[PDB]
Structure 1
């Protein structure tokens, strides 16, 4: 059909069809008379994975021969989504497979919808990991993702009576065709025990063993024939484990629990033992692998020339004391040399602002679980604090603040402090966030080692997030400027010369309208609800969090509702307001916000006076595959975090790329997005970071806003009085009480400027042509936010390797 989806050669289609029927028969053991859509999807998945195999083997072979420096991306989360379409895009098979399946009487789009998301992440951090792998493979880097193969990913969200219920994400039930088990590369991991000191140094003994079994998933680069590896570890009990008989076998589950389930907290630290086990497990098994591969090229001076280990937040911070443990206790390097090697090898990305998201592990946990690592951490602290004392003599307070050990009723290790000390590079994930790291939470560290601190602004892969999810927009762009932009997104600037082309204006608005029609129909088919597709699609999708201020949005929505009721016969620009996102199961307030959203919907969507002028939709089970559908359909992107709380954001970027205007605070990458597009082409409102700091000094009194803003007071009274909860009048008292007395995120402070700015959005939408010209200005300046740019900067400025766009042979 469309050009960026590749060729459908007659040989190619014929071959795909015969291999599809071979797999249906031999692999699935079905005949065509009993197959279901699910079988057809599996037959297709196996057919496509076949084209990965040669490329994967030759790639891994090439890395063994050339021996380049190897990048290890350690993360506890990889939010991969579906693999089938991405594989077809990256191998230029999409049209051929479409054609092949079409001649077998099947609709490929319908088979694609059968694939489960690999939901091994919570949101932004996990998804960044996934975009990174894609960009690492596309830029020909010898890169490996390492993590945990959780049996259960992020829970499936049901809404029952307007409340979130959680169900186990049994993503492996039907099998994962994209993974290859490698039980032959199974490795031991140790826990508990104790430390013996000898003449020949320290010895970690009487440990419990858990086995780590790797599953490899291929990561195809974009049309370069590169296929990198994502290796995920699974926990298995040793066979002499606990070894009356029956109970011993059943207790194997205690060890295997380590890889059972993803912790579902977004920007929240929960200090549980099982989580610490998860962190050590991926670190211990990964480092053994790294070292094994290094030794197949007794001398570790070259280690940092052959190995970069990137830590995705502090979650794998134990890689630092583990690398030391291996080098000092097993390889018998002296401390100072081992440490040099460790620092030159490791680099730490911070993804975190909020104090309650910083990992601070109680010492008694580390003492029991990882006794040698705690000895090593203490030794790191002492040597580190000795350098602080020498540089800042007499500054005893600095010593207290910089210590890796926090004093308290419970002593804790500050894993962030461990990462800065133990890494040659520390970066944040957007310019304003990297500035905040230097000015506030890591000021002291910055003053000691200024050279370590960098910025690497985040990005998203334009393969999944343009070509894949929005083929029609990719196409009209490729019509004017060619295909090359897909791996070089800066080329979208060339679209600025089409900003006054009537035909391009028509095509951009046409694609948007088709995306809306298609998403609206998706809502009817799968969830029986009727949206006006000529309305403005106002969408806020991201995890449910106080700092992301879904509640500010709710206040806007209720304001529009009250304005319509006061003046029912006045014209207003119609909106479909859609909010979606999961709340962490233990976050009471996030769960209340979801409930308020659905409660608002029940009032607004059933008011006859409102008509189709205002609709409020809670989008259930927000995940990667739903993002691929709703983001191309959106007109307005809501990026409305309180200034200084969103480290970067990446949703923001996905929307800019996909033809929606942004309403947002000067937070995270919003700042850079506005700077790229021009402030005139962005709906910026509200407090800056500096304003928030001024408000904090004089004290945030929410009451002042309630007293001065009648529209706002009206809303608080409706919430309190049970306008939105007739049967439980007091349902939302916790929301009111928090907004009035304990709002860390200053929702009321931004309320007035948000409502005003929302009016400017409405006014522009009234003028389709100028709306669309502004969209073009956004798409055309979104180049910077390619994860290819991000990864090239990581490669050049941290890892010391040169990216490449040159294809391996096919």
Structure 2
């Protein structure tokens, strides 16, 4: 069937009986009234049973050996589905496939019933998910800590070409993977005031909200390790009658919904509450566990990784506990804090940086504000001693920003209180040291590091592309699944006629599979022989879905100009959600559907060009589209995409990449060789040069006839007959206030696209270049990334040793 494990006689028999047992006792159903959803749950509970034993002994193992614990704090964990992933990591896939087959059921059908755990917005949230997988696979005593949102990222509906949002009620039918632990509920304090008495300050008259944890198992790849992801849920304490009970839903709103902002900051009180909620509950858990195992050894037994500044309050909260509750002297407490905390930055765009108004912190967390002021005072004294007389440096590095309203720069807070600060791609980390954090780098160079992102090869290859994983294993074995660098061995098969044919065959199969799904759940048909040109990621101006749109319109205009001229057929697919309040992003989605409305119904175009907007892009959809892609669009303006991870997913799955020298694209091209990548556009240096001179879009419009035609088509209502000026905001933006210079890369982009079409016409050479990419994608495994965090930041050695059964 495939290398999805063995389908043993004893195991298939056992799975079948436990399946029927759960269907009866757990679901309380009989085969006469059971529906597909019932079958999915019976299967889920059956697979879940297999990891409880390992989950219990893994945790017992950590208690006995007492290794250093790694705590990954994040407000997002974009997990997706967990049924297939669990079967994969437990080598249970073929057995379950056979067992369900014998029961007369199609396992693939049941898998589609599971709801995605969409507790994330995009890249940052997915990274945390891949990291959890790699830490377990590498045998690290790691814990993921976050919030159990009852509503994750909204489900996207497209109506009249516009994005409509609807609540993601993912818990409606229940979650078989989590285990509520009400017995470990902890109190979290808000508001109140600070009292300064004899020995120490006291935080009193606070409002209390309970934090109830739900644990979810995180299985390592075939090593019998099962780590834990603990998500906190808000509960009101039990201490007009009716109204008082109804108002409990004021405290519980803290864990109600995920804020849908990808790369953007909203200073809302509810978001601040969520951030402190996760931090306060998590730190009590960490300390409790530690006291079990003098806080001098705290950093030797504890490491906390801050995923962006969202959990930055961990720094002053740790100080508060050590100083106020444990009564350690400030200097001692600060030493411990810095040594246990590390911070990861994910973007350089100013609007994404968290800068909380002082009046908010003052009211919600009065003690933390005082602690932050003290940290700032002591930090600035160090700066002053290192750079005497440099008064502007003092104001630039302050954690407190003056102006209209005073704010606290959480990024500055994180750098000051962490022993390590890292970017997520080489070019990004360099940019941090040369620009945004230049002053900090000059003060403490040793703190700055790079940790290039990666993706887990389990979910992003074995799970979503079994056909490719199989033809690869046929040649080099299965060891690469947990040691991706072994993919390089495929380089010796680049001239192998058999391999070339198999690689091309799996891609065609994936495309047919996806082309079918498209008609199944969406209905509209597409041509499987065309080049699948896809750009899937959150909608943002910096990602430039608009540059993609300009190319699509260029292709359409060229066809209309010379209809009987041959052009490589293409299906361009664009998908991604827009933040609810991001007007421009919503206009871009409308533009895409509008283009499709014209292009997809033009008789002259035929099946040579199709424009489709992939609705509700999420983890489960990514697993379907990526394995089917031919061309991966990674065209952000140089210097804006910190790393990107979708780019790695495409590379590992046999798609060629067209992109700018931005984020990880640079290292990907470096690994595969620039001749095997379609690079175009301005480099970071070119962008800076243009800014020095002053970007004037008009220049491009005046010197490029094809570009002018497109703008006039948009302006005149060619793509919006009933509403002639529908896209006036888009044109105005491109022409007068385009922060990402779409026009500047237009010419080189279309030129580059012609080169990809030329290579696609030569199937054999296209595939050989593909093999060159897959063979060199090893560096982008999150196992490599985590091994570097472990050795260079956390001070722990990864292990590939199977746990005692």
Tell me the equivalent position of 1:105. Answer: 104
Distance (whole Å) between structure 1 residues aligned to residue 333 and residue 273 of structure 2: 25
- Please give the residue correspondences for 1:555-574 in structure 2 after superposition, counting only pairs within 5 Å: 555-574=550-569
Tell me the equivalent position of 2:800. Answer: 805
Distance (whole Å) between structure 2 residues aligned to residue 177 and residue 413 of structure 1: 41
Distance (whole Å) between structure 2 residues aligned to residue 609 and residue 271 of structure 1: 51
Cα displacement string for residues 373-411 of structure 1 (whole angstroms, at most 9, x for unaligned residues): 000000000000000000000000000000000001100
Cα displacement string for residues 643-676 of structure 1 (whole angstroms, at most 9, x for unaligned residues): 0000000000000000000000000000000000
Distance (whole Å) between structure 1 residues aligned to residue 289 and residue 769 of structure 2: 51
The answer to which of 3-12 and 18-27 deviates more is 3-12
Tell me the equivalent position of 2:127. Answer: 128
Cα displacement string for residues 277-304 of structure 1 (whole angstroms, at most 9, x for unaligned residues): 000000000000000000001x100000
Secondary structure at the residue paired with 1:562? helix
Distance (whole Å) between structure 2 residues aligned to residue 717 and residue 524 of structure 1: 34
Distance (whole Å) between structure 2 residues aligned to residue 246 and residue 286 of structure 1: 33
Count of residue pairs brought into register by the alignment: 805
Tell me the equivalent position of 2:703. Answer: 708
Distance (whole Å) between structure 2 residues aligned to residue 363 and residue 733 of structure 1: 39
Distance (whole Å) between structure 1 residues aligned to residue 127 and residue 489 of structure 2: 27
Secondary structure at the residue paired with 2:212? strand
Secondary structure at the residue paired with 1:441? coil
Moved over 3 A (4+): none
Distance (whole Å) between structure 2 residues aligned to residue 482 and residue 428 of structure 1: 34
Secondary structure at the residue paired with 1:189? strand
Secondary structure at the residue paired with 1:65? helix
Shift of 1:200: 1.1
- Please give the residue correspondences for 1:241-640 in structure 2 after superposition, counting only pairs within 5 Å: 244-297=240-293, 299-640=294-635
Distance (whole Å) between structure 2 residues aligned to residue 353 and residue 683 of structure 1: 25
Shift of 1:589: 0.2
Shift of 1:757: 0.0
Unpaired segments ≥5 residues, structure 1: none
Distance (whole Å) between structure 2 residues aligned to residue 3 and residue 375 of structure 1: 60
Secondary structure at the residue paired with 1:336? helix
Cα displacement string for residues 522-559 of structure 1 (whole angstroms, at most 9, x for unaligned residues): 00000001100000000000000000000000000000
Secondary structure at the residue paired with 1:758? helix
Cα displacement string for residues 195-246 of structure 1 (whole angstroms, at most 9, x for unaligned residues): 0001111000000000000000000000000000000000000001xxx100
Distance (whole Å) between structure 2 residues aligned to residue 543 and residue 675 of structure 1: 26
Cα displacement string for residues 724-776 of structure 1 (whole angstroms, at most 9, x for unaligned residues): 00000000000000000000000000000000000000000000000000000
Shift of 1:593: 0.1
Cα displacement string for residues 769-790 of structure 1 (whole angstroms, at most 9, x for unaligned residues): 0000000000000000000000
Shift of 1:4: 2.2
Tell me the equivalent position of 2:727. Answer: 732
Shift of 1:352: 1.3
Distance (whole Å) between structure 1 residues aligned to residue 265 and residue 93 of structure 2: 41
Distance (whole Å) between structure 2 residues aligned to residue 714 and residue 281 of structure 1: 53
Shift of 1:578: 0.2
Cα displacement string for residues 4-45 of structure 1 (whole angstroms, at most 9, x for unaligned residues): 200000000000000000000000000000000000000000
Secondary structure at the residue paired with 1:228? strand
Shift of 1:595: 0.1
Shift of 1:473: 0.1
Tell me the equivalent position of 1:792. Answer: 787
Shift of 1:349: 0.3
Unpaired segments ≥5 residues, structure 2: none
Q: Are residues 1:681 and 2:680 paired?
A: no
Cα displacement string for residues 619-651 of structure 1 (whole angstroms, at most 9, x for unaligned residues): 000000000000000000000000000000000
Distance (whole Å) between structure 2 residues aligned to residue 809 and residue 28 of structure 1: 33
Distance (whole Å) between structure 2 residues aligned to residue 5 and residue 268 of structure 1: 41
Distance (whole Å) between structure 1 residues aligned to residue 762 and residue 59 of structure 2: 54
Cα displacement string for residues 46-80 of structure 1 (whole angstroms, at most 9, x for unaligned residues): 00000010000000000000000000000000000
Cα displacement string for residues 180-207 of structure 1 (whole angstroms, at most 9, x for unaligned residues): 0000000000000000001111000000
Distance (whole Å) between structure 2 residues aligned to residue 57 and residue 292 of structure 1: 19
Distance (whole Å) between structure 2 residues aligned to residue 459 and residue 178 of structure 1: 25
Distance (whole Å) between structure 2 residues aligned to residue 768 and residue 209 of structure 1: 65
**Aligned Cα RMSD in Å?**
0.3
Cα displacement string for residues 110-165 of structure 1 (whole angstroms, at most 9, x for unaligned residues): 00000000000000000000000000000000000000000000000000000000
TM-score using structure 2 length: 1.00
Secondary structure at the residue paired with 2:508? helix
Shift of 1:572: 0.1
Shift of 1:458: 0.1
Secondary structure at the residue paired with 2:292? coil
Tell me the equivalent position of 2:12. Answer: 13
Secondary structure at the residue paired with 1:393? coil
Tell me the equivalent position of 1:114. Answer: 113
Distance (whole Å) between structure 1 residues aligned to residue 152 and residue 392 of structure 2: 43
Distance (whole Å) between structure 2 residues aligned to residue 798 and residue 107 of structure 1: 45
TM-score using structure 1 length: 0.99
Shift of 1:3: 3.6
Distance (whole Å) between structure 1 residues aligned to residue 436 and residue 774 of structure 2: 34
Cα displacement string for residues 71-109 of structure 1 (whole angstroms, at most 9, x for unaligned residues): 000000000000000000000000000000000000000
Secondary structure at the residue paired with 2:205? strand
Q: Are residues 1:51 and 2:47 paired?
A: no
Distance (whole Å) between structure 1 residues aligned to residue 106 and residue 3 of structure 2: 19
Distance (whole Å) between structure 1 residues aligned to residue 142 and residue 302 of structure 2: 10
Secondary structure at the residue paired with 2:658? strand
Cα displacement string for residues 661-695 of structure 1 (whole angstroms, at most 9, x for unaligned residues): 00000000000000000000000000000000000
Distance (whole Å) between structure 2 residues aligned to residue 308 and residue 486 of structure 1: 28
Distance (whole Å) between structure 2 residues aligned to residue 442 and residue 525 of structure 1: 50
Distance (whole Å) between structure 2 residues aligned to residue 475 and residue 809 of structure 1: 28
Distance (whole Å) between structure 2 residues aligned to residue 797 and residue 432 of structure 1: 19
Distance (whole Å) between structure 1 residues aligned to residue 569 and residue 727 of structure 2: 27
Distance (whole Å) between structure 2 residues aligned to residue 346 and residue 339 of structure 1: 11
Distance (whole Å) between structure 2 residues aligned to residue 351 and residue 237 of structure 1: 34
Cα displacement string for residues 251-278 of structure 1 (whole angstroms, at most 9, x for unaligned residues): 0000000000000000001100000000
Distance (whole Å) between structure 2 residues aligned to residue 102 and residue 344 of structure 1: 53
Tell me the equivalent position of 1:229. Answer: 228
Secondary structure at the residue paired with 1:251? helix
Distance (whole Å) between structure 1 residues aligned to residue 368 and residue 81 of structure 2: 38
Secondary structure at the residue paired with 2:79? strand
Cα displacement string for residues 282-329 of structure 1 (whole angstroms, at most 9, x for unaligned residues): 0000000000000001x1000000000000000000000000000000
Shift of 1:809: 1.4
Distance (whole Å) between structure 1 residues aligned to residue 2 and residue 714 of structure 2: 53
Distance (whole Å) between structure 2 residues aligned to residue 152 and residue 667 of structure 1: 33
Secondary structure at the residue paired with 2:3? helix
